[PDB]
Design a protein that fits this description.
Chain E: It is found in: Virion. The structure is cut from a larger assembly and holds five copies of chain A. Chain A has 418 residues and is α+β, with helices and mostly antiparallel strands. Chain A contains eight helices and 21 strands. In chain A, strands 8-2-5-12-11 form a five-stranded antiparallel sheet. Chains A and B meet through β4, α4 and α5 of A and α1, α2, α4 and α5 of B.
């Protein structure tokens, strides 16, 4: 079916749409809250964050412009500062500099938020979050979000619509199946998953996003209906979906300290560059019945189309590069075989049907024009002398085209059902 | 592992900025990832009929069932316990209904492959017994 | 095995809550986890020789 | 395309990163310009080299 | 060996304990069959 796929459709989905989340991790409290009985500043504060966490933790939403959504924590406007202004402020503050451990950006924090993308406004849970005032350099108090307690992470669903949408439909339906077509899901950051659309147990491609607020970025995009039994419960489908889902392990961290160590592995930045990415590797590359068999042989599948880019390895690592060029969230890339091979295979399928390999009674009158039928050790009974009956059996064992219209040999028709 | 407040810990997380290391392994050899001179002159014994059916239904490849994202699964502990991944899971998998139907019909008519020297089951079933 | 290190365990549910735990015939009177983690990592001398 | 046209994309991050793409490679006739560039990363040449 | 000292280094390769965990142990591979 060829050497390359056509890219027939491209779509991009982001869990929070325009909204992204910057993430700051510290050893101690760096902020103040409206009305707090005690400066919690510099204290150790353990918290539930997916798990029992000894770390202090700060979240801050932003758009590509640099401005931040109008954010309410409970019934209170958190009065969020623009992102670049806070960043300047948080790293200028005396205490904050020395126990900020890590910083990264995430497309999904692990919660379905109350976010209206229309009006650029976000409302946060009074109990999980708290307004965080980091204030002072020479001055400038900035407001951000401190995470109080997130005991459990949840999943967010994405409905991409008709699973078969985008593919240019040919009238031989099998050419929509694998390996003729394949839906690819990728974050374009080194994570990549091929899906056989026919084996998605749903009329729609529905994607499940799961996240975390751990020490580094981790987001997973899933298709829980993939290879799921009809009778499998929703929760169970999501649980097992990890095996065939797309896990963004990439650390979307932004740099904070040279030391000796950062430099040493910038001494070893290159070592991770000795990928072998394209030496990777590939592994590159007169009866009607026997008439068809030879035809199968002459167009015999020489190789499958891998659809794993040898440049997958190099895609992540640089967060400034990805978000600069607008690489974010999950992308659904639907691929279909080249037009040349569609014509070829479609024409073949049209005349001599599909490969079947099961025992049943044969479709003799399903199409309007003709039915090709070939059997092996077929059984045909009836009130006929066993000599003749034995001959008829061989006729279908050898393959035969049964016509239903008087225009015999005219294969140009549609030959649809009924 | 859970993060541990120290003089040490900021050194601990460049240990994990070694996720750019997961790039070589999680890609696998996904790159890697009927008897036409029969028949004429019998035609045809029930045995060779079955042989051709075996040839036309020949196993091209086994189903790996090894997820290529194994490499990426265990890194984040907060992620695991957050999304409720914990303990052992038993996932029972079986082939698609289309092939069950396919193979069942075949086995039903012409029995199983045996490859043993013995005296044959000639009258075990209520309706019919295939023997070669 | 013979281990030279000191060692502490603490049971918990995802809620943050702790099971009523008896060591022998004595109520261990277990603190919630979040409180302890806060407490154990607040003592500075002890903290940096936690392995 | 009748012409080999290459798309250069860049960054000013902590290290050097430039990618040369051919957005018309394996692109459907009816695929929008942006989408062609977007998907082009799979079949692009990614200069991850730090320089 | 049984452990005796955290330092900076022990922690760093506990930063890289996981890296040795990215085995590929069952994508290893077989070459199955």
């Amino acid at each position: 079916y060829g050497s390359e796929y056509d890219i027939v459709s491209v779509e991009n989905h982001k869990p929070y749409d325009d909204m992204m989340f910057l993430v700051i991790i510290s050893k101690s409290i760096m902020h103040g809250t409206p009305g707090e009985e005690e400066s919690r500043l510099n204290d150790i504060n353990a918290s539930l964050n997916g798990m029992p966490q000894p770390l202090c933790y700060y979240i801050h939403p932003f758009y590509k412009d640099g401005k931040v959504p109008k954010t309410y924590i409970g019934d209170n406007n958190a009065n969020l500062s623009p992102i670049v202004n806070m960043l300047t402020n948080i790293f200028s503050q005396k205490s904050a500099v020395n126990d900020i451990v890590n910083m990264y950006v995430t497309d999904y924090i692990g919660l379905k938020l109350d976010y209206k993308n229309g009006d650029k406004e976000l409302k946060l849970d009074k109990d999980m979050f708290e307004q965080a005032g980091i204030a002072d350099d020479k001055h400038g108090n900035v407001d951000t979000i401190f995470v109080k307690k997130i005991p459990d992470y949840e999943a967010l669903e994405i409905d991409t619509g008709d699973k078969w949408g985008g593919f240019t439909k040919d009238q031989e339906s099998k050419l929509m199946m694998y390996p003729y077509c394949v839906t690819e899901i990728t974050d374009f950051k080194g994570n990549h998953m091929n899906l056989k659309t026919e084996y998605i147990n749903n009329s729609k491609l529905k994607i499940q996003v799961r996240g975390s607020l751990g020490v580094s970025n981790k987001v997973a995009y899933s298709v829980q209906d993939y290879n799921a039994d009809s009778a499998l419960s929703g929760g169970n489908r999501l649980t097992a979906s990890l095996d065939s889902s797309l896990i963004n392990n990439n650390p979307n961290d932004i740099a904070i300290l040279n030391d000796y160590l950062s430099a040493y592995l910038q001494g070893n930045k290159n070592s991770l560059e000795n990928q072998k990415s394209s030496i990777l590797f590939n592994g590159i590359m007169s009866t009607a019945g026997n008439a068809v068999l030879q035809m199968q042989a002459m167009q015999a599948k020489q190789a499958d189309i891998a659809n794993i880019p040898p440049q997958l390895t190099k895609m992540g690592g640089n967060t400034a590069f990805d978000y600069g060029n607008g690489y974010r969230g999950v992308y659904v890339i639907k691929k279909q075989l080249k037009a040349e091979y569609r014509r070829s295979l479609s024409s073949f399928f049209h005349k001599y049907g599909y490969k079947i390999n099961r025992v049943k009674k044969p479709n003799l009158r399903t199409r309007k024009a003709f039915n090709y039928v070939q059997t092996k050790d077929c059984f045909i009974s009836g009130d006929i002398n066993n000599n003749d009956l034995q001959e008829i059996r061989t006729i279908f064992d050898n393959g035969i085209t049964l016509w239903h219209t008087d225009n015999i040999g005219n294969y140009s028709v549609e030959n649809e059902l009924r | 592992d859970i993060a541990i407040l120290n003089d040490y810990l900021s050194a601990y997380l460049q240990g994990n900025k070694n996720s750019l290391e997961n790039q070589k392994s999680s890609i696998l050899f996904n790159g890697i990832m009927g008897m036409a001179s029969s028949v004429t002159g019998m035609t045809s014994t029930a045995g060779n009929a079955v042989l051709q059916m075996q040839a036309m239904q020949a196993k091209q490849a086994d189903i790996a069932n090894i997820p290529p994202q194994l490499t990426k699964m265990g890194g984040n502990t907060a992620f695991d316990y957050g999304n409720g991944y914990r303990g052992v899971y038993v996932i029972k998998k079986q082939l698609k209904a289309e092939y069950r139907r396919s193979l069942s019909s075949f086995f039903h008519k012409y029995g199983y492959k045996i490859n043993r020297v013995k005296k044959p089951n000639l009258r075990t079933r209520k309706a019919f017994n295939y023997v070669q």
